[PDB]
Specification:
Strand content: under 5%
Order of helices and strands: HH
Distance between the termini: 61 Å
Number of strands: 0
Largest sheet: none
Radius of gyration: 20 Å
Number of helices: 2
Length: 55
C-alpha cells in the first residue's frame, strides 16, 4: 500500500514474475534455504577436518 512508484513490480512484464512467485510460493524461504543450508555445509566441513587434523 502506498507504493506509488509504478517503475518496478508494476507493469505487465513485471507481473508475470509476481504470478510465478504465488504459484511456487517459496519465494522467500528458498533463498534463505540456500543460505542457511550453506552455513550447515561450511560448519560440518571445517569441524570434520579439525578432527582429521590429528592424523
Amino acid at each position: 500500500d502506498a507504493e506509488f512508484r509504478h517503475d518496478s513490480g508494476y507493469e505487465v512484464h513485471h507481473q508475470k514474475l509476481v504470478f510465478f512467485a504465488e504459484d511456487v510460493g517459496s519465494n522467500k524461504g528458498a533463498i534463505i534455504g540456500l543460505m542457511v543450508g550453506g552455513v550447515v555445509i561450511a560448519t560440518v566441513i571445517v569441524i570434520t577436518l579439525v578432527m582429521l587434523k590429528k592424523k
